[PDB]
Design an enzyme around this catalytic site. Structure first.
Site, PDB file in Angstrom:
ATOM      1  N   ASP A   1       0.784  -1.226   0.000  1.00 18.57           N
ATOM      2  CA  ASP A   1       0.000   0.000   0.000  1.00 18.57           C
ATOM      3  C   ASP A   1       0.819   1.281   0.000  1.00 18.57           C
ATOM      4  O   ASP A   1       1.316   1.715   1.039  1.00 18.57           O
ATOM      5  CB  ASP A   1      -0.878   0.006   1.249  1.00 18.57           C
ATOM      6  CG  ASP A   1      -1.963   1.033   1.255  1.00 18.57           C
ATOM      7  OD1 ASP A   1      -1.946   1.878   0.320  1.00 18.57           O
ATOM      8  OD2 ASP A   1      -2.832   1.039   2.132  1.00 18.57           O
ATOM      9  N   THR A   2       0.943   1.890  -1.182  1.00 16.69           N
ATOM     10  CA  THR A   2       1.719   3.127  -1.284  1.00 16.69           C
ATOM     11  C   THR A   2       1.085   4.316  -0.596  1.00 16.69           C
ATOM     12  O   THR A   2       1.707   5.335  -0.343  1.00 16.69           O
ATOM     13  CB  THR A   2       1.933   3.485  -2.767  1.00 16.69           C
ATOM     14  OG1 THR A   2       0.653   3.633  -3.418  1.00 16.69           O
ATOM     15  CG2 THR A   2       2.708   2.384  -3.454  1.00 16.69           C
ATOM     16  N   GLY A   3      -0.194   4.214  -0.274  1.00 15.27           N
ATOM     17  CA  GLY A   3      -0.832   5.325   0.435  1.00 15.27           C
ATOM     18  C   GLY A   3      -0.762   5.172   1.942  1.00 15.27           C
ATOM     19  O   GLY A   3      -1.273   6.013   2.669  1.00 15.27           O
TER      20      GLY A   3
HETATM   21  C1  LIG Z   1      -6.455   6.365   3.181  1.00 16.15           C
HETATM   22  C2  LIG Z   1      -4.921   6.329   3.080  1.00 16.15           C
HETATM   23  C3  LIG Z   1      -4.409   7.785   3.097  1.00 16.15           C
HETATM   24  C4  LIG Z   1      -4.374   5.620   4.326  1.00 16.15           C
HETATM   25  N1  LIG Z   1      -4.871   4.242   4.375  1.00 16.15           N
HETATM   26  C5  LIG Z   1      -4.300   3.363   3.379  1.00 16.15           C
HETATM   27  C6  LIG Z   1      -5.210   3.005   2.209  1.00 16.15           C
HETATM   28  O1  LIG Z   1      -4.380   2.452   1.199  1.00 16.15           O
HETATM   29  C7  LIG Z   1      -6.309   2.020   2.592  1.00 16.15           C
HETATM   30  C8  LIG Z   1      -5.827   0.618   2.971  1.00 16.15           C
HETATM   31  C9  LIG Z   1      -6.985  -0.270   3.407  1.00 16.15           C
HETATM   32  C10 LIG Z   1      -7.555  -1.168   2.525  1.00 16.15           C
HETATM   33  C11 LIG Z   1      -8.661  -1.910   2.939  1.00 16.15           C
HETATM   34  C12 LIG Z   1      -9.185  -1.735   4.197  1.00 16.15           C
HETATM   35  C13 LIG Z   1      -8.599  -0.924   5.153  1.00 16.15           C
HETATM   36  C14 LIG Z   1      -7.522  -0.191   4.681  1.00 16.15           C
HETATM   37  N2  LIG Z   1      -7.286   1.911   1.528  1.00 16.15           N
HETATM   38  C15 LIG Z   1      -8.533   2.424   1.590  1.00 16.15           C
HETATM   39  O2  LIG Z   1      -8.952   3.124   2.500  1.00 16.15           O
HETATM   40  O3  LIG Z   1      -9.288   2.102   0.493  1.00 16.15           O
HETATM   41  C16 LIG Z   1     -10.592   2.737   0.446  1.00 16.15           C
HETATM   42  C17 LIG Z   1     -10.367   4.145  -0.112  1.00 16.15           C
HETATM   43  C18 LIG Z   1     -10.937   4.073  -1.510  1.00 16.15           C
HETATM   44  O4  LIG Z   1     -10.945   2.690  -1.863  1.00 16.15           O
HETATM   45  C19 LIG Z   1     -11.400   2.055  -0.673  1.00 16.15           C
HETATM   46  S1  LIG Z   1      -5.105   3.656   5.888  1.00 16.15           S
HETATM   47  O5  LIG Z   1      -5.463   2.185   5.854  1.00 16.15           O
HETATM   48  O6  LIG Z   1      -6.183   4.450   6.582  1.00 16.15           O
HETATM   49  C20 LIG Z   1      -3.616   3.735   6.826  1.00 16.15           C
HETATM   50  C21 LIG Z   1      -3.263   4.879   7.511  1.00 16.15           C
HETATM   51  C22 LIG Z   1      -2.087   4.959   8.228  1.00 16.15           C
HETATM   52  C23 LIG Z   1      -1.199   3.881   8.134  1.00 16.15           C
HETATM   53  N3  LIG Z   1      -0.058   3.932   8.808  1.00 16.15           N
HETATM   54  C24 LIG Z   1      -1.625   2.691   7.598  1.00 16.15           C
HETATM   55  C25 LIG Z   1      -2.783   2.635   6.836  1.00 16.15           C
END
Ligand SMILES: CC(C)CN(C[C@@H](O)[C@H](Cc1ccccc1)NC(=O)O[C@H]1CCOC1)S(=O)(=O)c1ccc(N)cc1
Lengths: 99, 99
Positions: free
Chosen positions: A25-27
């Site tokens: 996860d690049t985000g």
């Molecule tokens: C939102 C971004 C800026 C940050 N998140 C990463 C994202 O890649 C996040 C990863 C994820 C996937 C599936 C379920 C739960 C989480 N995907 C996400 O929300 O997918 C949504 C947005 C649209 O599609 C669906 S995080 O999980 O909140 C996070 C925050 C801080 C750290 N240290 C670790 C992780």
């Protein structure tokens, strides 16, 4: 490897002797893993994203094997719906986004 | 380009004629933009993130430029910590993860 993004980029990791599946996860700034025990001292942290914030335990100097590459860094442990390998460890394995 | 991950992979996008900053996010299935006006009708969508599930507005077939690359596809609008470019548009611009 070159990983396309038609599906979720999932890989096998080994952490604390355990095999898990995780999303590259690049985000994500940091790596967060579902509840498990890890060695050493920890401190609380809040991390936030879609749907708000969750409380996690921050462990430092943890070694993870990611798709066969070793990396060391901070791992956050908490009630995440998916295991996430974040930038802090992606950098160590030389991962880049290319387009 | 090749984007390394030592810093957040933030790029400029153009949507509705406006430039915005957005995060390239391989962990996001979908693209999520902060509140703004987009043309046409929308439909409901539930997305789940680290904190839980949230309702957003789904607009289909929206023109967006991402770091200079043209995409046309689904954009979700809702409360997001940062504009997120997810896999649905990363695939259109030909992005891959490499290590
Ligand atoms: C939102 C971004 C800026 C940050 N998140 C990463 C994202 O890649 C996040 C990863 C994820 C996937 C599936 C379920 C739960 C989480 N995907 C996400 O929300 O997918 C949504 C947005 C649209 O599609 C669906 S995080 O999980 O909140 C996070 C925050 C801080 C750290 N240290 C670790 C992780």
């Amino acid at each position: 490897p070159q990983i396309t993004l038609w599906k979720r980029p999932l890989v096998t990791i080994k952490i604390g002797g355990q095999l898990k599946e995780a999303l590259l996860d690049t985000g994500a700034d940091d790596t967060v893993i579902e509840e498990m025990s890890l060695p050493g001292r920890w401190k609380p942290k809040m991390i936030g994203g879609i749907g708000g914030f969750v409380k996690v335990r921050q462990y430092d100097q943890i070694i993870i094997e990611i798709a066969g590459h070793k990396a060391i860094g901070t791992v956050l442990v908490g009630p995440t719906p998916v295991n996430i390998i974040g930038r802090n460890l992606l950098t160590q394995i030389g991962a880049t986004l290319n387009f």
